[PDB]
Symmetry: D3
Subunit: 338 residues, 6 copies
């Protein structure tokens, strides 16, 4: 009954290291992995961005963990929705019961490389909704055709399909899209934020599901949190500043194109700016209470990203002192196929 | 030192089965895998098309085999060249010395799903050449920008990079592109064909490499062949007809959009149409001689696709009776960093 | 009252020869001509493709035959619908009561030359339906404007107009478009196919007409058939293989771009593949029964394409032994204003 | 040896009437026909615009006259250059030695119907030059490919071909294009204008041919003139005003879209505006002198458009009183295939 | 209470001269200015085309006159509608109660320079209607987004705004657009035309306003007239021919691209062609009666363009002999913010 | 030693155009000789709260003062403004106010250009657009009928009939070394923002090199700098004014991709006084203002445009007029942005 999610930070860590650490996380009581889908890190100092789809095959073949993208933008910049659909179907077919397809509206940091018009957030939401339609049609396993405002799909069929499709999870912090997620998709993924914002997103998601005749109590509500654990408070604070200054950027970041841009913006970030966004302490009891609070709000899964380079030590510390003491409701839905 | 390539047919086989069979192939003396990059099978009866990039991670993590795409079209339909570059760099970074990036001009069967203008072959070659430029720029590990006829890349850098890039291998049967492959890339992959055509492609590749100041003797020349082994000749023939009628289609196939189109065309295919394209026999000595002949022509790697559903039996038969008796030149270059 | 249509194969025959043969066909009891609108032949061995619109003027001025395009794609590749409308209006104005405008969704073989995105069949049907709208608006003889998904027409008027427009005939083998043809157009043209498929197309056409308040009994139902007559059965078979291998290609052909593509595919075609698609016999009684059967199914016009180069001999043989013995219903509607 | 060209005005006359009149013109000593390629007449009162390509087949099959388009715009509005090439090849294949392909930059009056950007004249000239390239490639009878600024041609071949291609004649009044015509094409077609302008165009054409190593003395120099003959001078003048007011519009007309536009502009036209553009007289001796002058300038063919509805009477009058008295140089090149 | 509008002809006059003449016009009893928004003059002989938006700032800062564009095409060739909105808001904010935004469907003469597809009039009307929507949204002073057939506006707000927006006046001679003007906008501007045409436009405008629940009696109905005053009738006639031949072109002019085109067309214009379009006389009593007649038809403002170069003399003559004797209804609505 | 002078920077982001007009008139009385006017559609932040249409305002400035003035800067690269229209506007202003207008142009910011809903290129690509726009403007400035077809712009037969005898100078506003060089090569003068000595020297050097390689004499070409200051009655008020009014001054990072005032507003919450060093001088001490400006002259800038960030514009103008402008020492020969 004990469990917790590990957040695999492709922005920071070589994929070989992430693979080994996920294997260790499994040994230490973590039950699932959230894997970023980036082309670029936020900053050069972070220094990585593996191709997540290849890595997920390695994870799948060497562990029994559940895993998902957190998140892929299937809106036709880096990735056409038909390709995301095929990738998701292949992973679930190879590792049945284990994959969840996390999708979102994307950031310029990754999508700008293809040199196309970058729509405002509200327009990208419309793109995401159409992409969901494409993915769901392909997941039926029939020959489908699609023509909408944003995507054209000629006769296409997924021949390699699991018995049951992986759930589609939307990663968003927008009330509007949270409602739509409940209506159109299988579950919600959101970032750490204050109680008021989390409650609003949960409520919107529930309302959307209910208006579509669905039972939201059986739908995953997932949160991705950023923490900094280290041997001292001082090191935890320093790790957050050095490794994750984007965590202290409480402003919309979806239009910023270059790691060098975030790098220059990072020079403004101070410890104060991380409050409510990154917990920075050596006290593992406080980590436990922070996570428990989120369960109590109604989150059914938590994916934890430790911002420090001390991943192995973090994993062992959480395995020993945090995960065993988390109290999950017994019936709580988890992101996996019916 | 004994070795052979296994061709993993995503058109036909569930990725889980391919994974298990590659693991077995490794045990049985195969040293490398060629993996098709399809969205659709040629026919419904073939019945599969896994996303190769995810599968390759599984292969990498559970074997020590070399492996490559055979081939990916990085020309902006299913895949933007920058993404292919990133995928290749990630695989090589995770499995250093093991990945080779096979690329080609693509087929409508897979690319048509995105609903865009499909250029004639010669134009797609020009697209492929520009894509090679994009991939090579990204492989430098610097922040690069690119603006050409076909692709626009804004400031982009591969942060996750091996110390040394994987080789770029072009899959082609065109004399022109074979020459360009020698000039611009690291090695050649071509399908089975008669001696005259293979010699021409090898010669063009060599000429291209030499004119660019490279030594072609150190560059891989790879061939992908289709065979049908079974317990009897009769079963081998039947397997080819049922599973791989596209093997008997000696005509350009790059414009045909649907599995149902090939399926209807398959009704015309007869055993005669496979001669020189698919060896169909139970006689493993004849398999051995066929493969040895290709080595003798100057191919440094062979990837074998058995068309039958009897993959496990084929792998064990080749491991016992074929692979140990193949004679490779000792210095032969292999597709690796 | 005795009659039959002659199919003028622009893919195979020099326009001067077609002109002379149509003149002969008229003398021999044929009453109408169906003229292909191609840019390319299916194969180099066929070896021709005259511009049909110019030829039709010559036909019109030297015979009293009815004639139509079988068929023109007015969907904006080779031809903008406004130009097809003008051409049709001019022909009917010059030869009143004689022209019928046959249109269809087109094939890549002809349309690919302009280098544009080639939509799937269902999308091309939507283009065809919009083109019909454009043609019909122009046929009103008023100044019209049009803005739809596929076509934009600025203020345009046909000043040169017959008193009554030529009928619009759709050439299709699709149930959906057959229904739409009944709804939106004046008549149906379909290729030879088995009885079940022909009955379905007729039924769909009738349903479409009835739902639009039209009487389908007064609307032409036309079929184009391919035959091979020669002095012996053996020559008839050889003629079909050599001249019309596309007749033995029972698969969708609308995406294939080049004569050389069909030429390579032709190497697979055998006599068996022509059954139900091309009647191959020297026995003129069997030709008669085959055609009579189609009349009995409810076709009101038949256009016969003899695949052999023996056009003159075919015309004389049909004139002597086939046409006089065909029994047409007395009331049967014919494609004319 | 006696001859003259008849100009078939599709803007004014039903194609059936034009066919009969061309047959008569042949009987009366005319040897060739120039056929306008319009979609619209200049004015509603003109009232026609047959599809020339169909009509030319009828002309070809019922006469022995030479004939040409005067002119077709093969620049991708109404007509793609590959289709013009095929049409020209078919006509010449059916009627060898008789067809000449007249081409030009086109007018909005006809091209605007397809609803596309209408370039300035100089840009349309660049389009015409590229179209010439396409037509010439196709006329080789090989499989050709083309990719330029304006046209894309995928693997294309003319299987139906004459032994020798029809000549390409450019219709232009521009000095620059006249030079290019000499360089790239087989002959020049120009409208009636004052002596100075005609001499300049001839000179430019000659220079272009010479710089390309060609002999301009063997290349056709063709002029299309508008006349008004009738039983009295007064009727001839009235006929010009009523039927051909565009003849009195000495200004660029290539951008004007609608017959109704020209119709409204026609209300301003007066007899004076036709001087040098339309000869208006009943005196057939003066018709003779006018035409002879153009021969003397160096034109090797003249195509005469009588603006009046009295086509039959005009044809018979010219046949009796004008054509027999015209003196052509014995060697003069005529627009027809080598 | 006495008043009249002065029409500032940017096609003809250097902006510095227009500025001085407007200052004089104010002294002489004119109360408002209509300023053309051109890039090109109709003819080279006219010889000018200042950027009106810059000039209007000079006018605003050195007079107390009302003023408006007559008219700007906000349909995305020279000008994006968002920019017109901003310009209008700035002028009204700087000169409250004084600016009116006159808009129209534009002419190729000015818009063709940007090298884009030029739609037929009816299509340009649809563009104008969408532009009106954009301008009105921006005039609310909120952050707005817009996506229609012709224009895309991302999050945009006018921070510099008057308390009350300037009125939107449509310049048109089309019955359809006149009705739409009443429905969607604040007032009508039309050119001089015969009584029947003016009555139809007024009636259409009124009907449109009434069907939208508005009171047309409180909405401006403005007319722009062209006159030629000079010391003699003969000079007045000559001035019209030389300076304003476009005034004698009673035909659609919206597709003609170049000053040189109009210049060549001008050679056809004769005095007769100006009847109802340009009053040509030295008799100032007849000027008075002509203007009074238009008031009597129901026009609430008249903008007078003297076609001659004798602007100063015209202004003084009108100030002395015409303006004091015009009788305006006391109630009459004038183009200015509520 | 030249006559006394200084440029006033008119901040359309912050101030109602009517206020700017009155303040420029006062600035003229107080010894300022030229105006730099921002060409924005949006302010950086809602708190700044304005964005008048500069082109209309410039007519009012021209007609009510004798000051020189320029756009600082207009992006003539076809988002808000087609280059042909900028050319016409510039020609009209110079024709109306000969000897007084300078056309300042640049690569633009998303903040203003994004409203038209188009692809926003990276800086280097926008530079290529700017270079083509310069070509278009210069062709139009010849006064002939011109045609243009390039990668970014198509101009059909177009002519400026309303033209000064001599065209206004084209000044490029840039902080990029590459474009600074191009400015020297292709244009008449350079405008750059306040920055450290190293960056300013690089831009000046690039500009000079570009001019020299094109056969021009850079000693006769304007080198202009726009600086942001905060003067107030106390240091404390000067600091507060900078934080409240001009937090973008403390954003030492590329800002050209950020679309919304609300985006900058949220980013502003991170800005602290430290972040303004070298970017905004914050002091009540007018002697220190004097030394700061003099230093820039000494580096080789021939014109300085001063933006006081505070709402105390009138007081700033009077203080500078009394205590700063009279004591600035300009080289006697120094070239100023104006037509030949
Ligand atoms: O809350 P923010 O700053 O928008 O971050 C959203 C998420 O963005 C994703 O790209 C990252 O992988 C996550 O680590 C991060 O939490």
């Amino acid at each position: 009954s004990s469990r917790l999610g590990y957040s695999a930070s492709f922005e920071q860590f070589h994929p070989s290291d992430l693979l080994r650490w996920c294997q260790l996380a499994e040994q230490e009581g973590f039950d699932s992995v959230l894997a970023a889908d980036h082309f670029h890190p936020w900053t050069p100092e972070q220094g990585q961005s593996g191709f997540v789809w290849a890595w997920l095959g390695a994870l799948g073949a060497t562990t029994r963990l559940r895993f998902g993208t957190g998140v892929t933008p299937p809106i036709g910049f880096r990735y056409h929705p038909a390709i995301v659909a095929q990738a998701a179907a292949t992973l679930e077919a190879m590792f049945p019961g284990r994959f969840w397809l996390g999708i979102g509206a994307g950031e310029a940091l990754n999508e700008h490389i293809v040199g196309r018009y970058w729509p405002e957030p509200a327009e990208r939401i419309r793109m995401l909704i159409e992409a969901i339609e494409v993915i769901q049609k392909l997941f039926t396993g029939k020959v489908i055709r699609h023509e909408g405002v944003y995507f054209k799909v000629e006769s296409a069929k997924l021949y390699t399909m699991p018995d049951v499709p992986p759930p589609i999870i939307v990663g968003t912090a927008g009330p509007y899209m949270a409602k739509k997620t409940g209506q159109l998709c299988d579950g919600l993924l959101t970032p750490g934020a204050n109680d008021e914002k989390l409650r609003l997103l949960l409520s919107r998601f529930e309302e959307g599901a209910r208006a579509a005749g669905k039972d939201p109590r059986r739908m995953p509500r997932m949160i991705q949190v950023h923490v900094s654990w280290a041997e001292t408070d001082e090191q935890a604070i320093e790790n957050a500043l050095r490794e994750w200054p984007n965590g202290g950027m409480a402003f919309p970041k979806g239009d910023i194109r270059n790691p060098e841009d975030f790098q220059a913006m990072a020079r403004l970030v101070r410890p104060e700016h991380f409050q409510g966004r990154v917990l920075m302490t050596s006290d593992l009891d406080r980590h436990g209470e922070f996570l428990q609070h989120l369960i109590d709000l109604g989150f059914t899964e938590i994916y934890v990203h430790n911002v420090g380079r001390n991943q192995e030590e973090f994993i062992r510390a959480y395995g020993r002192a945090v995960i065993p003491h988390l109290r999950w409701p017994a019936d709580a839905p988890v992101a996996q196929a019916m």
